[PDB]
Amino acid sequence: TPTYGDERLLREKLLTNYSKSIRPVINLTKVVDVTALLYLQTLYDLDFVNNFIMARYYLGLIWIDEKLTWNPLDYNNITSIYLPKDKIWTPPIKMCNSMDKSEENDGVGELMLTYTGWINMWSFRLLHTYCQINAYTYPFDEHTCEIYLCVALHTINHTRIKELIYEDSKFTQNYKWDINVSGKVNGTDELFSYAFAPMYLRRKLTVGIIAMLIPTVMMTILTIFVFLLPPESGEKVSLATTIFLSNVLYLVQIDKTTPTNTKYPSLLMLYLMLLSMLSGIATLGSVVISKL
Amino acid sequence: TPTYGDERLLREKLLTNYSKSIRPVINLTKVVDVTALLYLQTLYDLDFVNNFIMARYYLGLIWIDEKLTWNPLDYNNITSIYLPKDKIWTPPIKMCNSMDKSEENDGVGELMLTYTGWINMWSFRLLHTYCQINAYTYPFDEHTCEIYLCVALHTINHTRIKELIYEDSKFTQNYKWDINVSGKVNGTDELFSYAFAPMYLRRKLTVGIIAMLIPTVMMTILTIFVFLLPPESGEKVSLATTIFLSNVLYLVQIDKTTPTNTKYPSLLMLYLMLLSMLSGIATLGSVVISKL
Amino acid sequence: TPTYGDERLLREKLLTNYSKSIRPVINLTKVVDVTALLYLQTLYDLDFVNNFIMARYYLGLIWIDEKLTWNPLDYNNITSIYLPKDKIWTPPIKMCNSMDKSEENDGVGELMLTYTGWINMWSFRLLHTYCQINAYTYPFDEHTCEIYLCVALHTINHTRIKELIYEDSKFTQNYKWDINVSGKVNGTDELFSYAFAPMYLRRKLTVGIIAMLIPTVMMTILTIFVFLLPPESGEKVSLATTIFLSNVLYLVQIDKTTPTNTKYPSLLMLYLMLLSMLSGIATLGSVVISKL
Amino acid sequence: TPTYGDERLLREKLLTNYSKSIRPVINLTKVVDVTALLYLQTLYDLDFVNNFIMARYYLGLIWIDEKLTWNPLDYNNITSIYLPKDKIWTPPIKMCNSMDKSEENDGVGELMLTYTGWINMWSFRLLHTYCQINAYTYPFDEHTCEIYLCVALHTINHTRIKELIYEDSKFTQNYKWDINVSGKVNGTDELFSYAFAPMYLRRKLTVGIIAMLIPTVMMTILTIFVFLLPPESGEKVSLATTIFLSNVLYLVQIDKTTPTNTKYPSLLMLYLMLLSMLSGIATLGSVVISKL
Amino acid sequence: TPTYGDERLLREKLLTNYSKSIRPVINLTKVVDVTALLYLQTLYDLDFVNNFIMARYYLGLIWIDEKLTWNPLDYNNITSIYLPKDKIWTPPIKMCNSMDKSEENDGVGELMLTYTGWINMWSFRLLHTYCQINAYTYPFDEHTCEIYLCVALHTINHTRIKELIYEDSKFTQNYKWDINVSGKVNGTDELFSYAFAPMYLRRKLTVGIIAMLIPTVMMTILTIFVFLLPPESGEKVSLATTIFLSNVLYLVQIDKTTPTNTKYPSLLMLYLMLLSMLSGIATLGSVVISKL
C-alpha cells in the first residue's frame, strides 16, 4: 500500500525542475485549454440602487499539465496528490465583471492533481457583480445578469477558455427570485479569451408585495371617486388636498427606492405620477369652481 | 525536569522529514477523522433585512497525527509542545455557509500537540452566516439557523468530519433572543463530508415591544369606533382622513422594517393592511353618504 | 562608548539558539507571569444600536525572559536593545471580548528588551468591544463596559496574566460621557487565565439634551390641559387628533433610536407611551361625548 | 520548436544579475519613458454627496528595459515570456488623486516581456477618485473629472510619463451619463512627472427625471393660482398652509440630496426657495387681510 | 558615466554589514533627529457626527544615516540611489491621533538616499483623524483640528522629532471650508517625542446655506405675527397647531444633524427651541382664551 515516504519521494521527483512561471506545455506553440465550472450556491440579494447582485459560487477550473505526470505502478499505486496552490502554474482567470469580496479564510490554497496531469482547482467565491437592472415591468419584472470570466493576460495563442459549464446547486431556496442558471457555452476569442454565464432572475409574486400594492390601487379608486364627486359637495378641496399630500408622499417613497439607471422607468411610478397629475387637475377644478 | 534544550531537541527531531502537504497518515488509504467543537460565545445581532446572524464562536478542531509522536521518557517527560500553525498539516475546514469576518489579530497561529499525536486547534471566529429568516409569526416568532462546516477539497476517502459538538458557553446574557444550541451530530457524507449545528432562536417578549404594540391595538379600537360612528355625526370624513394617514404611515414604517424574504409575510403587517383597507371602506361610506 | 559593531555582536550572540516557539523559561514547569497595562486614550463613541463602544488604548505587555540576558560590562555598557516583534516569543494575549479594527499601520512591530530580561511591548489598539447597554434610566443613565483580556491557548500552568493595570490617560476631554477607568485587578484563573477592566460611563447632562427634552414636557402639559378642557368647547377632537399625531411621531422617533437590547426599556419611552395612551383616552372621550 | 527547457534556460540567463531596485538603463543619466494607457470599462456611479466617481479601468503601462534582451535565434525562436510582477523593476505609478479600492484578487502579478525589451503591464483598477462636482445647472448639468497619474518618487531626470492615451472601451452602456473620454496628452513636468485624463460627464435627460420634475412645476402653477385667488374666497389661508407644508417638505427633500460642495448652488433648489418665499408672502397677505 | 554595474557594486558594498534593527548611529549615545514635512493635499470632508476629518497628505520624513555614506568619486559620480523601504532602518513615526486608512497601493515601498547619508521618505497618507468639533457658532463657525505625530517606542534619548513643517499644497480648491495650515513647530519632549500641526477651518458662507436659512427667519416672522394676531381672529388655534408642527419638524431635522459632542450646543438650534417654546405659549394663550 502507498506510504508517506512514497508520496514524499513522488513529490520530490515531481517538482524537481518545475518553473511556476512557465506554462505547462512541452511545446510552447500549443495552447492550454481551460474549462471552468461555475456552480451558484445562494443569491444573497439583488441591490437595485447600486446595480449589483450578491451571490456565492463554487468556481472550478480544470486543465491539463504535461510536466506533472507519473506511472503510478512505479510509486505503489499513488493515483493522486494534493499540492499547495502557489507552487504550480495556475491559469490567470479573473472575475472580470465583478468586485471580488472573498476573504483569505475562503481561499483553499491547494489543488488536486491526477497522475494523467489533470488538475482540479475549486474555490469558494463571493461576488459583487455588475448587472444592468431594468425596472420597466416592476414588480412583474425579469432581468438578465451575465457573470463574465476572462483570461487575464495570456493571448488566445497561449491560453483559452474551452468551455463554461454553469448550473444551480439548489443549496438553498430563495422564495423571492426564480433563478435559472443552466447551459454550456464555448469561450469567445477576441484577442483574449472570455466567456459569460447568463443568469435569468424573475421576481416571484408574493402575497406581501400584493398586500403592499393594495393601498395604491384603492387610493386610485378614491381619486377616481373624488374626481367624480360633485363640485358643490363642499369637502372637495379638503379631501383633495389631503389625498394629494398622501399621493406625493407615496411618490417620494417609491422614488427613493426605484433604480435611477434603467432603459425605461417603471410603469408603476409613471402611473402614480399620472395619478398625481390627475389629482392636480381635480384640485384645479375644485378651486376654479370655488372662486367662480 | 525538562529544559529549553530538551524541547529544542525534541522539536528538531520531530520536524525532520515532515511535509506540510502530505496527510499525516502512515498508510494513505486510511482517512483522518476530524471532530469539531463549536462553542457559541455571543449572539451580536440577527439582521432581518440581510438575512444574517452575527456571532462569535470558539471553533475547535481535534484530530490524530501518526507522524508526530514521541516517547516522553526519552525527552525528560515533555508531554506536550506548541507548534506554529503554518508548519503542520491542518484540515481544510471552512465556514461553508458563512462570510468569515475575523481579522488576523484574532488568529492564534499556534496549536497544541500531545505526545500521543492528538492535536488541538482552537480559534475565535466571528461569522456573518446566512439564515432563512421567516417573519410569519412576528413578533412571537421562532427561527432556525444552521451553521455549516464542510471539508474543503479532500474526498470522504481522505478526510471526514467524525462529529460536531455544539454548545452554548453562556459567556453573556442576551435579553432579546432565547438561544438553544446543544447537541451532538455525526458528519454527513455526500462526496465531501460536512455537518451543521442547528441554532434555534426565539424572540423574548419584552415590555418594550408590547409597549410599541399598544399604539397599534388602540388604533384598531379607534378604527372600529369610527366605523361604528353615525354617518351624520359630522366628524366622519375628517377623522377617517386623519386616521388613514396614520395607518398608512404605520404601514410604510413596518414595511421598511419587515423582511422581504420569508416563507409567508408577517401576520401583523397583513392585519394592519386589513385595517387600512377597512379604513378605506369607512372613508368610502362616509363620502358616499355625504354626497347622497 | 557603545558602538554599532558592539550592538551587532550582542544581537548575534543573543539570538544564537533562540526558538521563537519555545516559551522563554529555563525550566518548563514554571509559568511566565504577564502583567498588562491598558491606558485608554479617547472614547470615540458609544453605539447604542449595535451595543459597542469605540476607543483607542495603549495596551502594553510586560514579562520576563530568562534566555535573553547579558552582562552589560561585557558589551561596552549596552543596557537595552530593540528587536523586531516577530523574532521573539510573544505571549498570545487577545482582545477576547472585542473586534480589533487596528491596521498594520498602527502595528509597531518592534519591542524593547532590557539586560535583565524584562521586555516591554507597547501597541496602539482601536477596539470595537461588546457592551451590555441598559437604557433604563435614560437620559440620566450609567453603564459598565468590561474590556476583557485572556491568554489564547496556553494553560494556566504555562502562561498567566499576573495583573491588569488600567488607567485613563486624559489625552482628550469627552464632554458627553464621564469616564472612570482606574484600578488594579489580579488575573482570574479558570482553565486559561483572563482579566478585565471595568469602565464606568455616565452621560453628562448637557444643555442641548435638556433643550431637546423641553418639547416633550411642554407637550405633556398641553395633553393635560386638553384632557381638562371642556368636552363642549368644540375644538377637543381637533387638537386631540393633531397632538396624537405629534405624539405618535415622537414615539416612532424615539423608538428608532432607543436600544432594543436592554434589561428594562427606557422609562422616558414608557412615559411617552403612557402619554399616547392618555391621548387615546382623551380622543375616545371626545368622540363619545360628540356622538352622545 | 521552442521547448520548456529552452524557456527555462532563457529565464535563468536573463535574471542572472538583475537587481529589482536599479532602474533598467545601461547609462543611469538617461530617463525611462513610460507611456500609460487608461481604458475605462464601466462608470459605476457618480456619488454627489461624497464628490467621488466609481469606475473600473484597464490601466496599462509600457516602457523599455535595456537589460532584458536576447537574440531569439539563440533560443529556438522564443519571442516573448511572462515574468512575475515582483521580480522585475516596475515604475512607481500611483493613482495620485484617487482612493484605490482594488483587491489582491484583481492583481495580475505578471507582465509580458518582448525580446526587444518592451514590457507590457496591464492591470484592472477600481478607483474612488475625487471630482469637483458643480450642481449649478442641475439636472441639465455637465461635469469634468480628471483622473491623475503621477510618478511616485523618481525625479524627472530619472522617470517620466511620456504620454497618457485614454479611451472608452464601450464594455457596457450607461443610460444615465454620456461619457466622453478620448484624447492623447503628453506628460507634465513640474519636479516629478504627472498627467491626467479629463472625463466629461453629461446627465442624460430621462423620462423618469422629467416625470419626477412634473410635480414641482405643477406645484408652482398651483402657487401662482392661489396667489391670484381672491383674498375673500375664505380658503386662502387653508391652502396656503397646506402648500407651504408641501413646499417645505420638497425643500428639505432636495436639500438632503443636493451637493454641499459646489461653485454655485443648484438653480432649481434656489427656484424652489423663491417659490417657498412667495408662498410665505401669500400666506402673509392672506392673514393680513383676514385680520383687517 | 555611471553604469548599472557601478550602482550594483555600490549597493553591494553599502549593505554589507547593515542591520535594519540597529539605529543608524556610530555612537549609540547620540539621538537621530527626524524632521517631518506634512503637506496637505485635499480636505475631503469634515464629518460632524463622528468628529472626524478626512484628508490626504504628503507625509515626508527626513533624517541622517551615518552608516550609509560613500565618496561618489569612487563610484563614477553616483550621487544618489533608491533602496527598498524595508531594507533600511526607518523611524517609527505613527499617526498617533488618527485612523490611517491608506492602502498598500498607496505605499511607495522605496526611499531616496543621498551620498551624505540624508534620506527622504515621502508617502501619500489618507487619514481619518479625530477632531474636537464645536458647533457653538453654527453656521458661522470656526474649528481647530490638530494632526499629531509621535515616535512610537524610542525614548527621547534615542529618537526625536526635530521639527514639523506643515503647509497647504493648494492642489484643489475647497469652496466650503477656508483652510489655514501653515507654520513651523519644534518637537515636544515628554518621555517620547511628539509634535502636532494645528489646522484652522472656517466654514465659508455660501449662498446655498443662507438660502436654506431663509425659511427659518421667515418662520420666525410668521410666529411673531401670529403671536401678535388678535385672540378673536379665529385662525389662532389652527395656525398655531400647523406652525408648531412645522417648528417641531425643523427641530427634529436639525437635531439629527447637529453634533452631540460640543463644548456648547449650537445657538441656532437653541434659538429654534426658543421659537418652538414661544409657539407653545402662543398656543396656550389661544386655547386659554378660547375656553374662557
Ligand SMILES: Cc1cc2nc3[nH]c(=O)[nH]c(=O)c3nc2cc1C
Ligand atoms: C492584460 C490585459 C490586457 C488588455 N488588453 C486590452 N486590449 C484592448 O484592445 N482593450 C482592452 O480593453 C484591453 N484590456 C486589457 C486588460 C488587461 C488586464
Ligand SMILES: Cc1cc2nc3[nH]c(=O)[nH]c(=O)c3nc2cc1C
Ligand atoms: C473543493 C470543492 C469541491 C466541490 N465539489 C462540488 N461537487 C458537486 O457536485 N457540487 C458542488 O457544488 C461542489 N462544490 C465544490 C466546492 C469546492 C470548494
Ligand SMILES: Cc1cc2nc3[nH]c(=O)[nH]c(=O)c3nc2cc1C
Ligand atoms: C485555545 C482556546 C481554548 C478554549 N477552551 C475553552 N474551554 C471551554 O471549556 N470553553 C470555551 O469556551 C473555550 N474556549 C477556548 C478558546 C480557545 C481559543
Ligand SMILES: Cc1cc2nc3[nH]c(=O)[nH]c(=O)c3nc2cc1C
Ligand atoms: C515622493 C514624493 C515627493 C513629493 N514632493 C513634493 N514636493 C512639493 O513641492 N510638493 C508636494 O506636494 C510634494 N509631494 C510629494 C509626494 C511624494 C510621495
Ligand SMILES: Cc1cc2nc3[nH]c(=O)[nH]c(=O)c3nc2cc1C
Ligand atoms: C511604545 C509606547 C509607549 C507608551 N508609553 C506611555 N507612557 C505613559 O506614561 N503614558 C502613555 O499613554 C504611554 N503610551 C505609550 C504608547 C506606546 C505605543
Ligand SMILES: *[C@@H]1O[C@H](CO)[C@@H](O)[C@H](O)[C@H]1NC(C)=O
Ligand atoms: C533538471 O535540470 C538540471 C539542470 O540544472 C539537469 O541537470 C537535470 O538533469 C534536470 N533533471 C530533470 C529530471 O529534468
Ligand SMILES: *[C@@H]1O[C@H](CO)[C@@H](O)[C@H](O)[C@H]1NC(C)=O
Ligand atoms: C512537440 O513537437 C514535436 C515536433 O515533431 C512532436 O514530435 C512532439 O510530439 C510535440 N510534443 C507533444 C507533447 O506533442
Ligand SMILES: *[C@@H]1O[C@H](CO)[C@@H](O)[C@H](O)[C@H]1NC(C)=O
Ligand atoms: C491500484 O488502486 C486501484 C484503486 O481502486 C485499483 O483499482 C488497482 O487494482 C490497484 N492496482 C494495484 C497494482 O495495486
Ligand SMILES: *[C@@H]1O[C@H](CO)[C@@H](O)[C@H](O)[C@H]1NC(C)=O
Ligand atoms: C431557462 O432559460 C432558458 C433560456 O432562456 C430556457 O431554455 C429554459 O427553459 C429556462 N428554464 C427555466 C427553469 O426557467
Ligand SMILES: *[C@@H]1O[C@H](CO)[C@@H](O)[C@H](O)[C@H]1NC(C)=O
Ligand atoms: C463548441 O466547441 C465544440 C468543441 O470543439 C464544438 O464541437 C462545437 O461545435 C462548438 N460550438 C458549440 C455551440 O458547442
Ligand SMILES: *[C@@H]1O[C@H](CO)[C@@H](O)[C@H](O)[C@H]1NC(C)=O
Ligand atoms: C529523512 O529522509 C531522508 C531522505 O533524504 C533519510 O535519509 C533520513 O534517514 C530520514 N530520517 C528520518 C528520521 O526519517
Ligand SMILES: *[C@@H]1O[C@H](CO)[C@@H](O)[C@H](O)[C@H]1NC(C)=O
Ligand atoms: C499499514 O498497513 C500495513 C499492512 O499490513 C499494516 O501492517 C500497518 O499496521 C498499517 N499501518 C498502521 C499505522 O496501521
Ligand SMILES: *[C@@H]1O[C@H](CO)[C@@H](O)[C@H](O)[C@H]1NC(C)=O
Ligand atoms: C512525568 O510528569 C507527569 C505529570 O504529572 C507525572 O505524573 C509523571 O510521574 C512524570 N514521570 C516522570 C518519569 O518524571
Ligand SMILES: *[C@@H]1O[C@H](CO)[C@@H](O)[C@H](O)[C@H]1NC(C)=O
Ligand atoms: C432545544 O431544542 C431541542 C430540540 O428542538 C430540545 O430537545 C431541547 O429541549 C431544547 N432546549 C431548550 C433549552 O430550549
Ligand SMILES: *[C@@H]1O[C@H](CO)[C@@H](O)[C@H](O)[C@H]1NC(C)=O
Ligand atoms: C454516529 O457515529 C457513531 C460512531 O460510529 C455511531 O456509533 C452512531 O450510531 C452514529 N449515529 C448517531 C446518531 O450517533
Ligand SMILES: *[C@@H]1O[C@H](CO)[C@@H](O)[C@H](O)[C@H]1NC(C)=O
Ligand atoms: C547552540 O546549539 C548548538 C546545537 O547545534 C550547540 O552546538 C551550541 O553550543 C549552542 N550554543 C549556545 C551558545 O547555546
